[model samples]
Every structure is written in structure tokens, then in C-alpha cells.
Target: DFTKEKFQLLAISSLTLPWLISLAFNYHHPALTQTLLSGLAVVSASFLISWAAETAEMDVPRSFSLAIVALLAVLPEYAVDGYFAWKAGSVGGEYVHYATANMTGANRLLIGIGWSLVAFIAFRTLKSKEVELDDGIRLEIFFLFLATLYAFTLPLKGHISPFDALVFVSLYAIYIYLSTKAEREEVEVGGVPAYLCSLKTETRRLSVVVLFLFAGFTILMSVEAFSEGLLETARIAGIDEFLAVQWIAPLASESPELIVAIYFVRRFRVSASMNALISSKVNQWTLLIGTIAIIYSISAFKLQSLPLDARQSEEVLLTAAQSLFAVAILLDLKISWKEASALFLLFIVQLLFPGVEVRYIISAIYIILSLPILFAKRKEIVESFRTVKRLISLE
Candidate 1:
């Protein structure tokens, strides 16, 4: 449970405006609020700077650019994640569990809510069309098989040290770079975008600014009110205080990005949808999670088994499993009703048997579920996988 009296100071002291300045100059509180305020200042300042830099990208513009802007806006959320990690470093061992839950819930919800919306719309859009879907799906299945085997490495894996965050971020960076290279190779528009985005170099930068101001102000108002609401709600309903902020309070806070994702996906823009999901992952594991790790290291805490336990373990396995499935599904790079069902089934298993080591089980499910489809498109899978392997060779 949050200490409300102190949380008020945190809220007031975290803001850098005249009002906060007045409170800081006059108030008789401890300096803890300075951290919040300073955090707000740094992220806010960077967002402003980034907003200024955003104007420079004049050549490429499109809905994709707008989508990129959205991705960039979440940067503060990522920064705040680091800041919060600093604040939380002194909290305790279990903080990682809650910290992870907040992000994991956000990720799962994207798949459950955001991806489902995309499927609904896309399924309807292509319902009457007869496009070939032979290659990508089989690959998705095999990659998932490999991922399932990897999932065994997680559970009780121990504190995801900054070392871990570094590794995760590096992997994600590789993913982004690979995807970027893949994009460059697409000849659809001669590697040129169809149209510039309204987010414009100017607009994107402005949005970045607005994101900073909005995030700082909103978080200042939000953390206090939300935390207080949690305390009051817990007291009135006699609920566990622990579930309040990290769980209940998180839903509202996390809704914006999800709404943005759903809207983009509904427009049949798979890239935007994928960007949101992937962007969130990058922010969490790379920026936010790393920020926390850095903070934990600075707070006199040894990395002991921080991120290893139940919740974080669940997430690590989930991502690895999903990545494999996704790659396999994209082996042919197509989507369909059955693939959706397989993913849903995987989702269900995670939800239903919270205690089971699900990676291998899901691996088997992926193999069985994908068998017919794989058999039908075996040639495509082999050829595409071979091509991709050759394209990405070490030699």
C-alpha cells in the first residue's frame, strides 16, 4: 500500500511548474519528491528535444510515419519505467514481480484485445478474396517448436539483471534492424513510401512535445489520484492492497496505447498493429525494464533472484513461445482463421493452467495444430526458410 501523505508530496514535488516550485520552496517535506520531479524533467526535456529533431525527417511520410510517431510517444512511458525503477529500487524483492506483471499484462492484453481486433477486421476484409497462403504459416509452426524448447530455460531464472535487460534489448534491436532491412528490400514502391504522413516531421516533433507535457502532467495527477484511489478502494472493499496499483490502477493507465493499436489494426494496417505490440515489448524489456535494473543495481540491491520467480518467468516463456509461433506463422507470411485459433488456444492454456510449464506443451500443440497446414505447404516452408537462412548467414 502507498503512503498517501507522502504520495501527495511525491505528486506535488514531481512537477516542475510554478505551483510545484511554490510547494517545494514553502513545504516542509522530505526530498523524495525531487526524484519524481527530476524524472519528469529529464524525460520531458528529451521529448521536447526529440520533438525538435522530428522535423528533420522530410523524405519519408505516410500513415506509417504517423504510426512511427505513436511508437515514439510511448518513449516517455519507457523513460518513466526507468524512473520508476529508480524509485522502486529500494522497495524490495517482490517489486520485480509487480513490475513485470504490469508490463506482461499490457503485452497479453495487446494480443488478446489488440490482435483480436485486427483479426476480426482483416478476416472480414479478406473473407471473399482467394489469396494463396502457402509459405509463411509452416515456418511459424517450426519456429514455435524451437521456442518451446527454449522456454524451459526461464522459470525461476532469477533476477533479470541489467545484464539481462541488455541482452533482451540487444535481441529486440536485432529484430528491429532485421525488420527494417526486410522493409528496405520490399520493391512495392521502389522502396519509397506512397505518401507523406500528416504527422509530418513537424507534427511528429510537436506530438513528441505534447507527449512529454501530457505525460508529466498526467502522471503527476495520475500517480497520486490513482494510488489514493487504490488505497480507498481497498479499504472500502476490504481487498488486498497489493492488487491495487500494479493491477487495478494499471488498466486505465495502459488503455491509451491499446486503443491506438486497435484503431490502427482495424484499418487493416498490420505493420502498425505489429509495431504497437513490438514497440511495447521494446519499451518494457529494453527501456523500462533496463531502467529498473539500473536502479536496482544502484539501490544497494544485489541482483539475487529478482526477475526469476512466477510472474516474470511466465512472461519470458510467453514471449519466447509467441515469437517462435509468430515466426512460424510468418514462415509463409500469411494469416488465417486457423492460425488465430492456434494462438487463442495457446492463450487459453496460459490462462487455464497457470501452474504448468507450458512451453513444451504449447510446442506440441503448435506442431499438431500446424501439421495439416504445414503438410499442405511443405514446399513453401522449406524454400522460404532456406532462403531466409541464406539471406541471414554468418559467413
Candidate 2:
């Protein structure tokens, strides 16, 4: 019996061994070496999370599972940026700005790089004209639109207050609740998930919990060194520290989610991958942004608004605009290669030519381009709101 189960056992251990080794070396190593080793840990964690989440779909509502997966898979992001927010109140210096900057950078990168890259790859590999979202994913799209709309208001006041946290956090709570009410369907899992799911029920359940806990911990442990390593590398290379942390740290923390999504696309599961990105955008906009205020307040031991300077305001405005444009294209539940390239190019141009003016300019371009699409799909936009209402009513 033991010999007969050899392949299944191999599949199970394969998921854990590399992860343990990577985490071990990452913890023991120094600076750049730590970063690379932890980077491997991140990849390992990504795979483990993916398989665990897939197997988990059998026990929970798929929609609920997906929401949890999206949130948990990006735990490192929350950890890294949450520290910045906490330090903002504790240190009372540039840390506040860094926290805000990291949040916006992560949100923008989720769309600019994550969304655009996935669409481009899916289009080329699947040889499809466009990647269309499933109708079931309309909830994410609708909530994303609501969040994106509210995000623009942040720069108007040049501050994020506890009130803003109430709004964003409430929205996230509702989104999660709504997701849980959806009907469950049979889940078809492949790869490691298939193997894991084949085990005895108790064994399978324990394995899922173990994988989730271990992977999340590994990801959290690795992020600081990975982020610091990038900062150190930038210092040696004469790159701006502010700029480095803004973009690079988020990229490092976001790698697991991106890696998971990219794996979905590589498997030609376009909708699943795109949904992951969009769901991440929802949380990044809502929960990610919302929680910082609470963290800052808790650290400060009083309610206070996180103030934004002129440059930070520009970053927020541009990030909100980018979200609007990307969501507008998704209004019809489809995204084409052309739209994907535009998103990618715009982000690249802005990154390549860094200036306060370039930020404003790119923000203007994003708003200008989004107008036409919003107008053309105005009816679908209305219907999206209606869809959300109906789903809520039924629930």
C-alpha cells in the first residue's frame, strides 16, 4: 500500500520541501543573498498557496474561497505596507508618505503591470482576440468601479482620515459578505490540487491548513529582506530610495499573487487569472487602503488623518485614474490586446520619465482616454450596478 502511494506522497512532499529549504536559507543568509533565497521562497509559497486554494474550493463556496485566496495570497503586501503605516504613527517622519506611496504603487502596479501583462500573455498564448470575463465575475467589476470612484476623492482633500477608512472598510466587508452568498458549484482542480484532494478527507483538510499557514508565514518572513535588499541595491546603483521603495517593495510583496495569476494564464485559464487580478484590485483599493488608517491610528493612539504632500497627492490621483481607465475597458466584460498595450505603455512611459509634471500629464491622459470608453459603455455600466443590486436582493 505504501509503495503504491509513492507518487502521491512525492507530490505532497514536493510542495513542502523546496519551501522549507528556501525559507531556511533565506533566514540564514545575508542581504542580496537573502533576497534571492527568499525570492525562491516566494515562488514556492505561491505554488503552495495555489494548490491549497484549489483543493479548498471543495470545502467552501468557490466565490468565498477565491476571495480568501486573493486576500491571503497578498498577505505579504499587507504586512510590508502595514509596517510602514504603523511606523508612520510611531516614527512621525517620512514613513507616512512611504506607506501611502507603497499602497498606491501596489494598487497601480496591480493594474498597470499585473493586468496588462496577463492580458498580453493570454492574448498571445491563447491566440484570442480578446479576453472576456465571465458573467459571474461582474460583482468584482462592479465593486471595483465603486472603489475606483471613491479613490479619486482622496487627493481632493489631500488626506486619508479615519472616515475614509470607515467607507473603504465597510465596502470591503460588504463585498466579502456578498461573495459568500453565491451558490457553490463543483470544483475541477488539477495538478497538485488534484493529488491533494484525492487523499483521505481529514488528511486533505490538514494538508490544506498546513500549506496555507506555512506558505503565508514564509511569504511574510521573506518580504522585509527582499524589500531591504532592493533598497540596498538601489543605493549602490544610485537610484532614489523613495522611488525604489514605492515601486520595488510592492513588486516584491505582490510577486506571489502575480506569480499565481500568471500560472493561471499559462494554463490558459484566462478568466480565472483575470478574476484574480481584478479581485486583488478590489482589496488593494478597499481593504489595503482602508486598513492603513486604522494601523496609523492604533500606532498614534488617537484618530488622525494621514496627510499627503503635493507629490504624494499626484501619485494617488494618477493611481485612481489608471484604475478608472482599466475598469472602463472592463465595463463590457472584455479586454483587448490594444487596451492591454495602452495600459502597459502608459505605465512604462511614466516610469521611464519621472517627474511631478509627468505624473500629472499621465494622469490627464488616463482620464481623457477613459472618457470615451465610459461614454460608449454607459449602459453596460448602469447594468453592472443593477446586477449588483439584484444579487444583493436575492441574497
Candidate 3:
């Protein structure tokens, strides 16, 4: 029967139609107009890819399905950051700075706004003061803990070497392998994915493939325009370009994930919501960061590292510090209202004082806040490591 599911699919797809037409016709709009339109296209594409990924679970092994979903879910981010990394290679100027700016911004935003907002919504809707995570999420948290520890070294070094990329990517590879060993759980598909999954098997697979291609193409077309438009708009508005790329670009790209997590929370699937966000953080910290240097080396036509200036180093440090604090909060497998508020407030405070000294101070504060919690949760930390060890040993 025809239902609102079709409308929902069409309505979301239609959001990208205008941008598609603009791309097809080579229509050039003003910077701000281009930013808004292309940014919306990326948002809609994210939703389409996400639904397609969910529907894909029916046809693929659970581990493969999860790997694809995780990769596709952040396709927009990969495109945007890949653009800057490529540009940095071809043109050696501020693009170098822009390269890591988006990466750092996205990582910090996931913990700051994404995690906290979902926790708050879960609290309000579930009437629970804390959001409890399942043991399955231990895999993500353990790997993320490893990644965050490695990420701290990033700031100490002036450049992200290919060796760093190797380490990060290797961690992700092990993570993927361990993920395959876990027992598969039944997934509850709803909304667009549910409707798609209801189709005849062959038709459903074809639809998923088409959606992936269409969304992938849409994001590829718009990311360059969207990224450049933000810079142009920032210049026109007299805002700092670095700040614009750091904050605004990430905010646009991350909106879809945040919306999806909120949807899960509304459904009382708070654990799923948190797991999804944590998985995203792990992906970004590992593959996304790893690939930037690889892309830079490729574009440079030689093996080279992506260098970070003083500001970029500080940004990376602050991002790692925030990740440490977040991991500490989740070490107990729960996030209280106080923890969520602390995440949000500390993030907001950094935004208010975006100075070199203040950033150092904020990073110190995050470490300071995390130390006691990590100490208190020492047993959980040990247990999480044991879980990881068991997961790795499982054939």
C-alpha cells in the first residue's frame, strides 16, 4: 500500500533536487546561497545513505553490513575533509590548516553536542537520569580509548606522518576483524529502511545500491562547493576563515548523524544511539584521520606528511583531551546528566574563548576532570581491557 514512507523518501530526496539541477546546469550562485543549498544537499544525501545502509543489513553479513554503514554514514565528512587534504597537497598554504580543522571539529562536535544532546533527550523521554550503554559497546569504547591515546601524540609531532596513518589504520583494521567475531543481533528497521526492506529481495538490493550511488554522487558534487562557499562567506562576513571551516563546516556535515541519534533516543533505543555516535567517533579518529595523510601523499605525487602549525596542534590536543574526558565518562557504561552537562558546558566555554592560551587551559581542564573519574573507574577500565582481549581471542 502507498504510505507516508514513500512521501518521506521523496520529500528528503527532493531537498537535493535543486542542488542537483544547479550542478547539472553549472549554475553559479553567491557564496552564501551556494553554501546553504549545497549544505542542504549534503544533509539529505547523508539521510539517504544512512537509510540505504540500514536496508543493506538484509542482504549482507552483519559485520560487513556494519562496516559499510559506518563508512557510508560519514561519507559527507570524508568528502569535505578529503577536499581540504587534497587541496592542501596541491596548494601548500592555509589548506594545510583547513585539512585538520574539519577533522578536529567533527571529532569534538560528536562528543560535545552529539553525545550530550542524545543523552539529554534520552533522559527527558525515558525519564532516566543516566543513559546506560550495553556491553557490546565496549568494543567501540575500547578501540576509541586506544585511538585517543594515539591521538595525543599527534599534537606533539608537528606533522602527521604516514607511519601515524599506518598505526591508526591498523587499529581500525583490528577493530573491524574483532567486530566480525561478535554474535549478530536482530536489527529493528523502521521508517524508510523498513519500507525498503519490505520490497522483494532483488528489488530491495537494487534500490539500496541505487540510493548509495545517488547519495555518493550528490555528496561528491556538493562538497567542493559547500567547503569553498563557507570560506568565501566567512571572508565576506569578516569572520575568521579557520573558525568558519572548523565550526560551520563540521556542523553541517554532522547534522545527519545527530538527527539519527535523536531519532533513536525518541524510540527509547538510547544504547543504540550512543553506540552509533561512539562508532562514528572511532571511525573519525582512525580511518578518517588516517586517510588524510594518505590523500595528501597521493595528491603531492610523493610520500609526505601533513604538517600542523601551532594552532592546529592545539586544536588536535584539545580534541584528544575531550575524547579522553568522554571515554572516562563512559568507562562505567553510563553517562549521567551531570556528565552530559559537563561535556556541553566545557565545549561551549572553549568556543567563547578561542585563544591559544585559553585552548591550552581548556585542554588542561579536560584532563583534570578526566583523571579523577578515570581513577575512580579503574576497575571498569581493567574490565573493558579484558573484554577487548576476549574479543580479540575469539575465533
Candidate 4:
């Protein structure tokens, strides 16, 4: 007879079996086969990560659960970009471009693609025009604001130095400590989370641990091959390496977090969906930036910073500008279809022009347009900052 256990097993197998099979035969396969296998593995691992993330809510406070899952879901991104940083340090060539491209791409994709996509999906599926965030999300918005503000300095500084790294890392640490003090919320159990929650407490805890470890291992095994395959595939098609790294590579590494947000939307868990992306932005802006410098310093056998040429500097500038504009739209704690479309369209429009001047001009446009909205929502911005006050006075 059909049962919940059977259903859970079947679901888990579908997401896991492809990865295992690919791992077994990954060596002998052609690039095409490897690409297909790795793609499947990434998708499967993403699903498992989402399941584990959702299920984790039952065991811990919601904020802590969100932070842990956000970290794990994008763990492969660290591996992928860290590889580029390592190359830059050891070889000292275009690897710097690759590392910067990947970082900027991943950051932009989260908002230009991930955030807008969430609102789009929520609108279409749930027939809701706006996805409203809970007040609890103020903490996330606040930290993101601080990070986005600091990110602007990078383009002008022309490098990511140890001081920059220290600041960003400290911001992430403070954010995590604040999350632990957040009021706990009851978890809503469904699907895999439901099945897992049905287990005895001891058994459920063990299963959760197993799922996290297995899914993490699966992603670790598959993402490097997946990144290489996509890179080669793009090269064969005559695509620019910078463009491919900036756009395509992120699609693979970011799939897990995006899928989790989409799954939440599918279940009409709108706020959860938004929260996932917000927390993800926090990690990317803080922890991701912080670690890259540390990696480069270690590999170079000295305390050297990662230097940026003009192109990379412009990319960082554009990325920061886009972040500013997007956050302005959400300052009031709501995202509507029109606002999401604006975010997506602005991002797409910038892609139409690849010149350096065009990038700077578009960045100016974003900043100019953002100012009015930010001014209008000054009160909400102040309210978000009050979250910092709460954090400081954690009495």
C-alpha cells in the first residue's frame, strides 16, 4: 500500500539516485554526459537541501534554521568562486576576472533574477499581486542595507583588502548573533518536512543530520564538474568567458536557493520565500565577500588583497547600484508585480549594452531613480534601523 514513508523514500530517491549514478560514472563520461549528469546532480541536491532546510525548522528557532540552510544551499558557490580566487593567487592571471565575475554575477542574480522571480511566481501561482514581508524580516533588510552601502566603496578602492574583509566578516558574525536572539516561531510542516516531523524525536534528529550531510556531500561532488561543463559548453558556443562566468555559472550554483524559495511560493508560503532570499543576500554580501579575501591571502603566501581592473570595478559598481535600487522598492516591506517587473527590466536592460560607459551610465540611472523612493520611505528605513537598536540593547 502507498504510505508516507514510501512516498518520502521515492521522492528522496528521485533527487539522490541521479547524483550517485553520475558520481560512479563521472570519469569515463564525455563532457556532454558529464554536463547532463552534473546538471541533474545539482538539481537533485538542491531539492534535498530544500527539504532538509524546511525540516530543520522543527528542531531549531526559525532564524537560526534560515541562516543554516542559506549557508548550506550556497555552500557550493563558495567552492566554485574560491577555486577562481585560488587560481588567481597561485597563477596570477585572468583568474582574478573569473573570481570577480562569478561573485558579481551571483550577487546580481539573487536580486535581478531570484527576488523578482519569487514575486513573479507568487503573483502567478497564488493570484497575489504583492508579497508582503513580516516585520521580523526587518533585521535582514537592515543588514542588507548596510552591506549594500559598504559594497559601493569596493569599486572605488580598486581591491578587496583585509580591512574590507574584516568589516564584512564582523557584520556577518553580528547578524548571526542577532538571529539567535530572535523570537522563535512555530514551524509549518508539509511534504518532506511533514514526513520527517512524524518520526520519533530521536529518530527525526538523526535523520535530519543524515539528510544534511548527504545533500551537502552530493553538491560538493557535483558542482565543480557542473561549473566546468557549463564553461566548456559556453566556450564551444563562442560565448565570452566573462559573460559566461557572470551569468551562466551562477545559474548552477544558485539553483538550490532559488528552488527552495520557489517551493515555498508553490505552497503559498510567501513570506518564507522572501525571507529565504533576503537571508541569502545577507550571506552573499557578507560571508562570501569576507572569505574570498582570506582565501586569496592564504594562497598567495602573504597578506595581499585581490586587485580589480577597470572592468571588474565597473561590474562591482553596477552590482551595488542594482542592489540599492532593488532594496528601495522593498523598503516598505512589500513587493508588488510592478516593482518586481521594474527590478527585472532594469537588470535586463543593462545587459543590452556591454560597454564600460554604458555600465556606469546605467548605474547612475539606478541610483538616481532609487533616491526618490528611498526618500519617500524614509520612515520605514528608520524603522528597519531600529532593529539594530534592538540588537544592541538585547536585554
Best by lDDT: 3
Error of 1 at 190 (Å): 23
lDDT of 4 by residue, 233-296 (tens): 7777778878877887778778878877788789878887787788888888888888887788
Q: Rate the local accuracy (lDDT) of all candidates.
A: 0.47, 0.80, 0.88, 0.80
1-395 per-residue lDDT for model 3 (tens digits):
64999999999999998889998899999999999999999999999999998888755766354645666778888899999999999887899999999999999988898889888999999987988888877788788889999999988887899999999999988888877787655678889998998899999999988998999999998999999999999998979998888888989888898888898788878877777788788889899999988899988898899998999999999999999998899888889999999999999899987789889999999999999988998998889888889987786
Write one digit per residue (lDDT tens) for candidate 2, span 160-230: 99999999999998988887765533456766777777789899999989988877777676666666666
How many pairs collide in each candidate, listed in order?
Answer: 21, 0, 0, 0
Q: Please provide TM-scores, in order, for all candidate models, with all chains considered together.
A: 0.59, 0.89, 0.97, 0.92
Prediction 4 global C-alpha lDDT: 0.80
What does the lDDT read for residue 223 in candidate 1? 46
* Poorest stretch of ten by lDDT in candidate 1: 185-194
Q: Measured by TM-score, how close is model 4 to the native structure? A: 0.92
- Which residue ranges in model 4 land beyond 4 Å of their true spot? 1-19, 22-26, 126-128
The model with the greatest TM-score is 3
Whose TM-score is higher: candidate 1's or candidate 3's? 3
Q: Provide the global lDDT of candidate 1 against the true structure.
A: 0.47
Colliding pairs, model 4: none
Candidate 1: segments with Cα more than 4 A from true spot: 1-84, 125-152, 178-217, 220-250, 265-291, 299-305, 310-315, 345-395
Worst 10 residues of 2 by lDDT: 1-10
What pairs collide in candidate 3?
none
Model 3 local distance difference test score: 0.88
For model 3 the local lDDT of residue 377 reads: 89
